[PDB]
């Protein structure tokens, strides 16, 4: 079909993937982060990254769409807001793209 079959929902994924390490990342970021400031850095990153990798633009847009959706409604102070931002950072992580975050 195609090379690099990373995009899939097969049983038992490659590399050390666990909830312990995952929750840890979100726990560290959620510890204290700013959506307003992060939105700028994230928006600028995706914008430039998209120009370099248009093939991933589709996936990148999805992540931003989620973060922007919550950011558009500055009032919902819950897990949805933290998940929106964290979801984007996690998306890029899997993509395996050296970005100014990790």
């Amino acid at each position: 079909s195609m090379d690099k079959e990373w995009i899939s929902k097969l049983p038992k994924s490659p590399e050390p993937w666990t909830p312990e390490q995952e929750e840890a990342f979100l726990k560290r970021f959620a510890e204290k982060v700013d959506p307003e400031e992060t939105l700028k850095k994230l928006e600028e990153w995706i914008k430039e990254n998209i120009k370099k990798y248009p093939e991933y633009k589709d996936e990148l847009e999805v992540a931003y769409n989620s973060a922007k959706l919550f950011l558009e409604s500055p009032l919902v102070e819950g897990p949805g807001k933290v998940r929106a931002i964290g979801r984007v950072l996690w998306t890029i992580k899997r993509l395996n793209i050296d970005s100014p975050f990790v």
Side-chain angles (χ1 to χ4, degrees):
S1 278
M2 244 202 110
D3 213 64
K4 308 216 283 260
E5 206 130 45
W6 239 241
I7 306 96
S8 227
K9 301 143 134 64
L10 279 159
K12 302 285 183 102
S13 134
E15 254 118 43
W17 205 89
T18 23
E20 203 186 310
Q21 85 198 77
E22 257 210 319
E23 267 148 63
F25 189 58
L26 213 301
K27 178 239 270 170
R28 273 169 211 282
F29 143 89
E31 200 239 313
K32 250 139 181 95
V33 74
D34 309 289
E36 263 252 59
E37 227 113 297
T38 296
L39 180 277
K40 287 287 265 150
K41 232 262 162 257
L42 183 278
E43 180 256 33
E44 202 116 306
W45 181 86
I46 293 179
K47 250 113 169 287
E48 207 267 324
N49 268 249
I50 272 168
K51 211 160 220 173
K52 243 132 204 283
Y53 316 132
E55 307 209 280
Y56 281 109
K57 173 251 255 92
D58 258 56
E59 296 287 314
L60 298 162
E61 261 241 77
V62 191
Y64 162 76
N65 262 313
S66 181
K68 171 260 215 208
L69 240 304
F70 272 88
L71 267 35
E72 200 73 70
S73 209
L75 233 127
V76 50
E77 298 130 47
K81 197 114 171 172
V82 57
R83 194 154 100 193
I85 301 136
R87 271 270 121 191
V88 181
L89 251 108
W90 270 128
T91 299
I92 300 152
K93 243 295 261 102
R94 277 204 83 76
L95 287 181
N96 200 324
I97 307 170
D98 196 353
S99 69
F101 285 96
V102 297

